[PDB]
Amino acid sequence: PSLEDLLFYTIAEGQEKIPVHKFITALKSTGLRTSDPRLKECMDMLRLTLQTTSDGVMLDKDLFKKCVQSNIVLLTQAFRRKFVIPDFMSFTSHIDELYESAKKQSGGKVADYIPQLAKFSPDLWGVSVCTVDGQRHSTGDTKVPFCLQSCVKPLKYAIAVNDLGTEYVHRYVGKEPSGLRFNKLFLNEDDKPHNPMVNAGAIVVTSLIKQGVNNAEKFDYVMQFLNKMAGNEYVGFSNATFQSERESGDRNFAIGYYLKEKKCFPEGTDMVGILDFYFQLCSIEVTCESASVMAATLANGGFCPITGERVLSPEAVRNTLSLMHSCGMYDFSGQFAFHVGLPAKSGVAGGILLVVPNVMGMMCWSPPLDKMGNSVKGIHFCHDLVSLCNFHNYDNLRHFAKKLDPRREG
Amino acid sequence: PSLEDLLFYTIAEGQEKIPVHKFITALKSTGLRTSDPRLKECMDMLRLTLQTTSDGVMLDKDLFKKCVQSNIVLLTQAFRRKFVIPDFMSFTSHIDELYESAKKQSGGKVADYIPQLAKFSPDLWGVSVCTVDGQRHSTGDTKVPFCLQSCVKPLKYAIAVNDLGTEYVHRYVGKEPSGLRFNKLFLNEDDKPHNPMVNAGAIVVTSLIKQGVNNAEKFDYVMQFLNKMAGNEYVGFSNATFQSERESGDRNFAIGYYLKEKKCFPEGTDMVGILDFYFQLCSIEVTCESASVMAATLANGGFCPITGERVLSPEAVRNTLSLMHSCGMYDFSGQFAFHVGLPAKSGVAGGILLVVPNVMGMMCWSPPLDKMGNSVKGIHFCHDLVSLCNFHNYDNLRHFAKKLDPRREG
Amino acid sequence: PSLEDLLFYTIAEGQEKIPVHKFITALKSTGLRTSDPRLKECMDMLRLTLQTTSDGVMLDKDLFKKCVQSNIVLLTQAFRRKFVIPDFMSFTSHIDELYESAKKQSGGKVADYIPQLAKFSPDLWGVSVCTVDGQRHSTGDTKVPFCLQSCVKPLKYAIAVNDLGTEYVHRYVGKEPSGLRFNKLFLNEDDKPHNPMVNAGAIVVTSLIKQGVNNAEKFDYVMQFLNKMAGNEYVGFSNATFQSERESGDRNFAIGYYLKEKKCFPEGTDMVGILDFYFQLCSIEVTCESASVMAATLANGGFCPITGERVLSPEAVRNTLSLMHSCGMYDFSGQFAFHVGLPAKSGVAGGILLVVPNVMGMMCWSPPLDKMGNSVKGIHFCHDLVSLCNFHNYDNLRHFAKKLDPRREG
Amino acid sequence: PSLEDLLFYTIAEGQEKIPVHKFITALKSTGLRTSDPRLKECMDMLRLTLQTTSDGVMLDKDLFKKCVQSNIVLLTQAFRRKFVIPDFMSFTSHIDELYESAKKQSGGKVADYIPQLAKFSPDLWGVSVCTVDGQRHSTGDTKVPFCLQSCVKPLKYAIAVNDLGTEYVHRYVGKEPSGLRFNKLFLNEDDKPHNPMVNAGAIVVTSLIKQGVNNAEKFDYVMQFLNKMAGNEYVGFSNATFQSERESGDRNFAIGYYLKEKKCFPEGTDMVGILDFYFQLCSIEVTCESASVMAATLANGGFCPITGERVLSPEAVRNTLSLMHSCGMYDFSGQFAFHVGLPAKSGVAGGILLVVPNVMGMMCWSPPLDKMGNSVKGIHFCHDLVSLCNFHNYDNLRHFAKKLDPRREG
Ligand SMILES: O=C(Cc1ccccc1)Nc1nnc(N[C@H]2CCN(c3nnc(NC(=O)Cc4ccccc4)s3)C2)s1
Ligand SMILES: O=C(Cc1ccccc1)Nc1nnc(N[C@H]2CCN(c3nnc(NC(=O)Cc4ccccc4)s3)C2)s1
């Protein structure tokens, strides 16, 4: 009694076969998108079948088996409701309420220190969800590219710890928040930057990646790495933001020369080239949709959820989530850690890279920032989310009062 | 087919009578103690039955049913391996190796500013486990009484947030760590102590509990909460420690008056009386085993694991856990959050109150402190614990490299 | 060839028989007062001759000599214009213009944290001058008693360096200003208060004075010493201030307990007793006129200018003046040192103890303090004084542009 | 009678003619140099007279008049012993004692971050005196050129206050010492550097001087300014140290970008070019003797003591001396102010620019620095000088215990 046939009848309702649209609809309702890389063969076999019989197609059991056999295990988990969020249709309904609610918060100031950022309209607002099992949901402007800015800091920290290990990386950068009044100091008592989530630390981290090769190859290697983290969804580069960040960033040059003088770089660092590498990394483009997959790689222990590929070592993933917890929303980090309890990372383009470990990854994006540098809609969304679901890090998974737990049906 | 029935067949394993000791040995091997408050009716019936039938010692199906009918639900989960840690026998093997490995860590200095903590032998070393289901295990000197000291700061903060709620409590005290040299500034920029886990924060929080009645009743009020949290195991009091804490507490007096000058207490606070209360709360005694139940209650979203009693609101538990994470280990807080990633609190007696949310609570006691005030052996144990098991708060439950997950078997 | 009437003709004006009023008036015109202790005998001989005769009286070349012979050398410099300010009468004319100019300044708030300090009227305003030669001038409420408060800090520090020397004293207290927003810290990086002019330093200084003996005898000794410093003009004690300063002294008890815990006191100190002694010293009363003598003892290298008695070692006077320069006006100290350039010390009763080295001492008193604790009228008077005369510590004695030099005559 | 003649009678001492050498020796012993600018006429006539009348050579009274007539006033004060240090031959013997004492202090380390200062032998040790009246004395290596380094910081600040006034300049820089081990902060809380005497402060002052012209002209305008201050003694320039200072100046570029980002420079500043000007001003060369004249101009209210020329406004001179008092010896400033009480500035090349207000200026030079950056020999010298002489700024001029007063005689 084989899986492909049990599934066939589970979808077959006792009618002797299954219309293709009716398989596509049942698939989409599990959260999986028909373009999921892990479903390629199934979809290739489907489109081959719709070249044959162009009147239908209506699939019997061996023809259904013919398409679905290569992806049956992933399909059985989808259809039997084994994903981390079983009733994904209900849950994306709540995401949308949360989306509409936060959309009413028009406050904040679009970052304008740079013309590329000032140009973005304050009304742009998108939330994208990718769960640990590949369930996708978007609402809003989830396909408009924008710059990762400081959202790239946890990613490139991840890469560095991935390639070099925790111990090496933290020879050069701390692992604690500075305290709501060393905001302004570049270095802790040990003469290292306080953590990889602030600019001095991000800049040092940058000097660690793929040492020995030139900047063009370093950027290629980070790009190929982001490509894997996003399951080959959109990752681009904004040369306008780049040129302009590097002509309008005296603060970072001040940090660079400070780091150089205190001997904060590995031996042989070319500090002015590192800053230029840094500015490019800040100008990498993503969409809400592709950036949520990247977070979901981090929610999923370093496996990209829509491709199954191992992208980052668990160590790198745990360090990254750890520092995003305490250091990820700038001056709001401790408040965010207390009330939201989620690892998150914000950037000046208006994005919050949000990770719900073991559940989902998310990317919120609205250009208007509050006075601490965080997207107003983004922040408002993060508070709502944790007020709704027991996703706060220290919510209890058994006794969670009247909050909703999307991981369950009852 | 009733459940006391199905389970009777589960234990009988072929025979039609079950020897009593066979049911007891099966019970103990689930981690449950035979003294479990949730098992009293069943254990009273087994005692009575052995009195009225020394012509055994074997339990019919009808007889086994008269004994377990009371506690059948729990006994079901214990026996159908439904507890948070199913193979508890193997897990305690690991706790014992962890215990032995930390035991060989002879360094440190016993706190001798009081002649009551100075008396304790450096060789005392105890580790007690109580899971979210009541599963108990202890190794080492887990029945020696010692003073909580600063391990009581999360407990009384939890009581404050329980009775008064998050917004009121944090009018008087912050929710962030300070910075690894703001250890000496009693106040943050809003003239609030930084968090409840430092002395000025504990002192201010002590002043929010049971306002308006004397220290006799305030104390009894807190003790009664500490009894419910520990499932009514040992919660004592060391008047010897308390007299010396108050004869030798220049700094807290420095803090108390400084707090009074800055208007940090609620209106009509008798600060010098609040310091005396505070010194009393520090002198409360526990054992590794009784305190492990307190940790387990915070592990369990505020329900005591061996009684089923709701002791704390989720809100209280979530805040307490949030702040033990980032502030609970003094100047080691940030490194502890990074490498161990578990809510913990330490005290100058040598305790570390340890919480694995949704899994278990623990208490580790060894008096010799490292130069940052934390028990050497406790600290070494906590690192090994999370090297071995995917209990780091930002470990992943599905992809955890070479770590072991005791929540599943095979 | 006698000095005694190379002078009576200096006074005689060709006429050969000097009236008394005309000798007193010429005396007063030099700045000396008819009650100068150095002039007692000459005034004793005048009191006797004024009863030998009611018909006059007046003097000739031998009963003049009869009265003045005892104090001739001091009289000769007085009448030959050899004092530090020759044309004293035009100088008091400027002090009066400075006085009245500052009286128009109604800003400020009278310290009211003490009902004694809130008792005093905002309209009180007095400036008192005593030069290094005993020349006196007053204008305004220069006889109203008021507490020294922090004005006593340089005095008791002087006494302390006097009795124990520079090296011993600075084992316990620093000799620099802190940094204009590390006022809040009680201890520098060596665990000493920053300087004797802040409350932590003053409190440590208080613990050095007359160690071994008790508070009643210690207060008598400071009083004897203040009495010498002030040429036995008015010094007293306000108990109302004392009792109110010791009820409302939470900050000082914070310093006391902080100091004791960091082991900041000489071995054997009774901290709580030192604070009461400290509170007494702040309650010591003076007048403008009497305090200006105390300042003039410091202007004059430690000799009281109206008795000639050597009250303080030079060491003590230099150290005191050094630190009143940099630390004596609280958070205004560095501005004050920059613009006024005079060793000065303020207190919350409204007093500015002002010293012009090698020239004069003063006491300004007006109770309305500014936002930084300094008497408004006082500060304003001090700026005017240095705008007008080249008394700025880094004015040039030879080239000084538009400024007047009262020490000269062209 | 005439003053040339009266003075001729005093040097002739009975005979009818004064040998020329008898008059030169009389003049030199006053401390004046035979090359004094204010003496060129008299000295030109003396050389011309030894040509036109080789017959001797002895100056009758008519011939002595023809030589000293144009310089009679200065020669009078020189010979009626009316200079600020009357017995200059006795005081120089003391400077020589102070010199040789401090010579035996071979400790400290020569600045080596730049090759051209690692050049200098650790045994070079020169002390030069120039009084407020032109009396000169040198001992040691007083004609070796060295770089002003930070000794230029009071000079250019003076130039800036001279041309711009106190109020404008101190919109851009403060006037207080920072706080010891608060040397790291480039900015105080008004986002101004702390004082002109630290690098951030100096760099901002550099950008106020002569806004609107290129570095060629800014530099020349400062140089001609230093020249007048040195009475046209040697004021050089080490293009070697400038090129090197600019290659290895990471901290300064760090300061530069930091200040530009904080909007610390006058509008329209070319910060990179301001840094190059700054590195130039640091490379200006002097000698002990020439810089001793620059300090003497600061000793003398801004008049160059050997030319009579007004160089700096008294305001400029008083601010500079105020800030050298509190901020001029790096982290030793507060200790230096306390024990030396003399306006001084130090530099990495080994120089201490020292000012005894109203008396003399000095340059001590020895390349080995102590750990705080201050010349070990210079520091040792300054302490000896003030232990010997009542030159401490808060020494008393009339009561100075056993200290010696070189302003006095018998
Ligand atoms: O330990 C050293 C040596 C040392 C070492 C290294 C450098 C300097 C000094 N010195 C000292 N540490 N602590 C001292 N005094 C205790 C009594 C009063 N205390 C205060 N608590 N909070 C304060 N500030 C605010 O509430 C406001 C604020 C918040 C954030 C930023 C700015 C202002 S004052 C602590 S003395
Ligand atoms: O912050 C204000 C005043 C201000 C301005 C406005 C409002 C309030 C206060 N001014 C300024 N902030 N930042 C400035 N410049 C940056 C250049 C690199 N700087 C560093 N200095 N020190 C660092 N770390 C250590 O030394 C290690 C350590 C930490 C703790 C204890 C002991 C040692 S990094 C900061 S200048």
Coordinates of C-alpha atoms in Angstrom, one line a residue, chain A residues 20-259:
Chain A
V20 CA -4.7 19.1 -11.8
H21 CA -5.9 22.5 -10.7
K22 CA -7.4 20.6 -7.7
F23 CA -4.0 19.2 -6.9
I24 CA -2.4 22.6 -7.3
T25 CA -5.0 24.2 -5.0
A26 CA -4.6 21.5 -2.4
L27 CA -0.8 22.0 -2.6
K28 CA -0.8 25.8 -2.2
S29 CA -3.1 25.5 0.8
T30 CA -0.3 23.7 2.7
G31 CA 1.8 26.8 2.3
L32 CA 4.2 25.4 -0.3
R33 CA 4.6 27.4 -3.4
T34 CA 4.3 25.6 -6.7
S35 CA 7.8 26.9 -7.6
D36 CA 9.5 25.3 -4.6
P37 CA 12.9 24.0 -5.7
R38 CA 12.3 20.7 -3.8
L39 CA 9.2 20.2 -6.0
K40 CA 10.9 20.8 -9.4
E41 CA 10.7 17.2 -10.7
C42 CA 7.0 16.9 -9.7
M43 CA 6.4 20.2 -11.5
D44 CA 8.5 19.2 -14.5
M45 CA 6.6 15.9 -14.7
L46 CA 3.3 17.9 -14.4
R47 CA 4.1 20.2 -17.2
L48 CA 5.2 17.3 -19.4
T49 CA 1.8 15.7 -18.7
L50 CA -0.1 18.9 -19.6
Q51 CA 1.7 18.9 -23.0
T52 CA 0.2 15.4 -23.8
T53 CA -3.5 15.5 -22.9
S54 CA -4.3 19.2 -23.3
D55 CA -8.0 18.4 -22.4
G56 CA -7.8 18.2 -18.6
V57 CA -5.6 17.0 -17.4
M58 CA -7.3 14.6 -15.1
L59 CA -4.9 12.2 -13.4
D60 CA -5.4 8.6 -12.5
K61 CA -3.4 6.9 -9.8
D62 CA -0.4 5.8 -11.8
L63 CA -0.2 9.1 -13.6
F64 CA -0.6 11.0 -10.3
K65 CA 2.1 8.6 -9.0
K66 CA 4.1 9.4 -12.2
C67 CA 4.4 13.1 -11.3
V68 CA 4.5 12.9 -7.5
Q69 CA 6.8 9.9 -6.9
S70 CA 10.1 11.9 -6.8
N71 CA 8.7 14.3 -4.2
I72 CA 6.3 12.1 -2.4
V73 CA 7.9 12.3 1.1
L74 CA 7.8 16.1 1.0
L75 CA 4.3 16.0 -0.4
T76 CA 3.1 13.6 2.3
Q77 CA 4.2 15.9 5.0
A78 CA 2.6 18.8 3.2
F79 CA -0.8 17.2 2.7
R80 CA -1.1 15.2 5.9
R81 CA -0.4 18.5 7.9
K82 CA 3.0 17.6 9.4
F83 CA 4.5 21.1 8.8
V84 CA 5.6 23.3 11.7
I85 CA 2.5 25.4 11.2
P86 CA -0.3 22.9 10.2
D87 CA -3.2 25.2 9.5
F88 CA -1.0 27.6 7.5
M89 CA -4.2 29.1 5.9
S90 CA -5.4 30.3 9.3
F91 CA -2.0 31.6 10.2
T92 CA -1.4 33.7 7.1
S93 CA -4.8 35.2 7.9
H94 CA -3.4 36.5 11.2
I95 CA -0.2 37.7 9.4
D96 CA -2.5 39.8 7.3
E97 CA -4.3 41.4 10.3
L98 CA -0.9 42.1 11.8
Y99 CA 0.0 43.5 8.4
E100 CA -3.0 45.9 8.1
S101 CA -2.7 47.0 11.7
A102 CA 1.0 48.1 11.3
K103 CA 0.1 49.7 8.0
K104 CA -1.8 52.5 9.9
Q105 CA 1.5 53.6 11.6
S106 CA 2.7 56.3 9.3
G107 CA 5.2 57.7 11.7
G108 CA 8.9 57.8 11.4
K109 CA 11.3 59.4 9.0
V110 CA 12.6 57.9 5.8
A111 CA 16.4 57.9 6.1
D112 CA 17.6 60.7 3.9
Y113 CA 21.4 61.0 4.6
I114 CA 21.6 59.3 1.2
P115 CA 19.6 60.2 -1.9
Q116 CA 19.0 56.5 -2.8
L117 CA 17.3 56.0 0.6
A118 CA 15.4 59.3 0.6
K119 CA 13.8 58.4 -2.7
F120 CA 11.9 55.4 -1.3
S121 CA 8.2 56.1 -0.6
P122 CA 7.1 56.0 3.1
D123 CA 4.1 53.9 2.1
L124 CA 6.1 50.8 1.0
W125 CA 5.3 48.1 3.5
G126 CA 5.8 44.4 3.1
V127 CA 5.9 41.3 5.4
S128 CA 7.1 38.0 4.0
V129 CA 7.0 34.6 5.9
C130 CA 9.0 31.5 5.1
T131 CA 8.6 28.7 7.7
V132 CA 11.2 26.0 8.7
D133 CA 9.4 23.7 6.2
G134 CA 9.2 26.1 3.2
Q135 CA 5.7 27.4 3.8
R136 CA 5.6 30.8 2.1
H137 CA 3.4 33.8 2.7
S138 CA 3.7 37.4 1.5
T139 CA 1.5 40.5 2.0
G140 CA 2.5 44.0 0.9
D141 CA 5.4 45.2 -1.3
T142 CA 7.2 42.0 -0.8
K143 CA 9.0 42.0 -4.3
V144 CA 10.4 45.6 -4.2
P145 CA 14.2 45.3 -3.8
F146 CA 15.8 47.5 -1.2
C147 CA 19.2 47.5 0.5
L148 CA 20.1 45.2 3.4
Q149 CA 22.2 47.9 5.1
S150 CA 22.8 46.6 8.6
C151 CA 20.6 43.6 8.0
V152 CA 23.6 42.2 6.4
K153 CA 25.6 42.3 9.6
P154 CA 24.2 39.0 11.1
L155 CA 24.6 37.3 7.7
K156 CA 28.3 38.2 7.3
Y157 CA 28.9 37.4 10.9
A158 CA 27.3 34.0 10.2
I159 CA 29.6 33.5 7.2
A160 CA 32.8 34.4 9.1
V161 CA 32.0 32.2 12.1
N162 CA 30.9 29.5 9.5
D163 CA 34.3 29.6 7.8
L164 CA 36.6 30.4 10.7
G165 CA 34.9 29.3 13.9
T166 CA 33.7 31.1 17.0
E167 CA 37.0 31.4 18.7
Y168 CA 38.9 33.0 15.8
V169 CA 36.2 35.5 15.0
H170 CA 35.9 36.6 18.6
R171 CA 39.6 37.4 18.8
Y172 CA 38.6 40.4 16.9
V173 CA 35.0 41.3 18.1
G174 CA 33.0 41.0 21.3
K175 CA 29.9 39.1 22.0
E176 CA 27.9 41.4 24.3
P177 CA 25.8 44.6 24.1
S178 CA 27.7 47.6 25.2
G179 CA 25.1 49.2 27.5
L180 CA 22.6 52.0 26.6
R181 CA 25.4 54.5 27.0
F182 CA 28.4 53.0 25.2
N183 CA 26.4 53.6 22.0
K184 CA 29.3 55.9 21.1
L185 CA 32.4 54.0 22.2
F186 CA 33.9 52.0 19.4
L187 CA 35.8 49.5 21.5
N188 CA 35.2 47.6 24.7
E189 CA 37.7 47.3 27.6
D190 CA 39.6 44.6 25.6
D191 CA 40.1 46.9 22.6
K192 CA 37.6 44.9 20.5
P193 CA 34.3 46.3 19.1
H194 CA 31.5 45.3 21.4
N195 CA 29.7 42.8 19.1
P196 CA 29.3 42.1 15.3
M197 CA 26.0 44.0 15.1
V198 CA 27.4 47.5 15.5
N199 CA 29.4 49.2 12.8
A200 CA 32.9 48.8 14.4
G201 CA 32.2 45.1 14.8
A202 CA 30.6 44.7 11.4
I203 CA 33.7 46.4 9.9
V204 CA 36.1 44.1 11.7
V205 CA 34.0 41.1 10.8
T206 CA 34.3 42.2 7.2
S207 CA 38.1 42.2 7.4
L208 CA 37.9 38.5 8.5
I209 CA 36.0 37.1 5.5
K210 CA 37.9 35.4 2.7
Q211 CA 41.2 37.0 3.6
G212 CA 44.0 36.8 1.0
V213 CA 41.9 37.4 -2.1
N214 CA 40.8 40.7 -3.7
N215 CA 37.6 42.5 -3.0
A216 CA 35.9 41.5 -6.3
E217 CA 36.4 37.8 -5.3
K218 CA 35.3 38.5 -1.7
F219 CA 32.1 40.1 -2.8
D220 CA 31.5 37.2 -5.2
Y221 CA 32.0 34.8 -2.4
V222 CA 29.6 36.6 0.0
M223 CA 27.1 36.8 -2.9
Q224 CA 27.2 33.1 -3.7
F225 CA 26.7 32.6 0.1
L226 CA 23.7 34.9 0.3
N227 CA 22.4 33.1 -2.8
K228 CA 22.4 29.8 -1.0
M229 CA 20.9 31.4 2.2
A230 CA 18.0 32.6 0.1
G231 CA 17.5 29.4 -1.9
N232 CA 18.5 31.4 -5.0
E233 CA 15.6 33.9 -4.7
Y234 CA 16.5 37.5 -5.3
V235 CA 19.8 39.0 -4.2
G236 CA 21.2 42.0 -6.0
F237 CA 23.5 45.0 -5.6
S238 CA 22.8 48.7 -5.6
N239 CA 25.8 50.6 -7.1
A240 CA 24.1 53.9 -6.4
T241 CA 23.8 53.2 -2.7
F242 CA 27.3 52.0 -2.8
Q243 CA 29.0 55.0 -4.4
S244 CA 27.0 57.3 -2.2
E245 CA 27.5 55.5 1.1
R246 CA 31.2 55.7 0.4
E247 CA 31.2 59.5 -0.2
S248 CA 28.8 60.1 2.7
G249 CA 30.3 58.0 5.5
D250 CA 32.8 59.9 7.5
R251 CA 31.6 58.0 10.5
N252 CA 32.8 54.7 9.0
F253 CA 36.2 56.2 8.0
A254 CA 36.5 57.5 11.6
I255 CA 35.8 54.0 12.8
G256 CA 38.3 52.6 10.2
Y257 CA 41.2 54.7 11.2
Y258 CA 40.4 54.2 14.9
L259 CA 40.4 50.4 14.3

